């Protein structure tokens, strides 16, 4: 027959019949590349530590989302501040740099 035994970093020790105990330790030979493209790095650090890698990726996504939301909110507030006085008055001879910048 064949028996599968998971071996962690702490190690494992198996005794088969009358033989002396045999000890084996798991390396960190995950499939991937820590010095390659981002997907290879994510695969390598997900196979070693899935929970930690998932936490890091979720945190990075949240940081990107909140940064983008903050930038959009600040740009829109700047548009309000620098445009609402000119929208309440006639003949808004506006230098078009502001509108061109924050229209997109």
């Amino acid at each position: 027959t064949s028996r599968n035994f998971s071996v962690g970093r702490e190690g494992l020790e198996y005794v088969w019949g009358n033989h002396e105990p045999v000890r084996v330790w798991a390396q960190e030979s995950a499939p991937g590349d820590p010095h390659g493209w981002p997907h290879e790095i994510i695969i390598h650090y997900y196979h070693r530590h899935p929970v930690y890698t998932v936490i890091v990726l979720c945190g990075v996504a949240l940081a990107i989302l909140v940064g983008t939301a903050s930038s959009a909110a600040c740009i829109a507030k700047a548009r309000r501040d620098c445009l609402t006085p000119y929208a309440l008055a006639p003949n808004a001879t506006v230098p078009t740099a502001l509108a061109v910048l924050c229209c997109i």
Binding site: V7, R23, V24, W25, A26, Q27, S29, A30, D33, P34
Partner: peptide, 10 residues
Amino acid sequence: PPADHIIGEP
């Protein structure tokens, strides 16, 4: 990363 998956040394 290491090539061998299991080693017999702590």
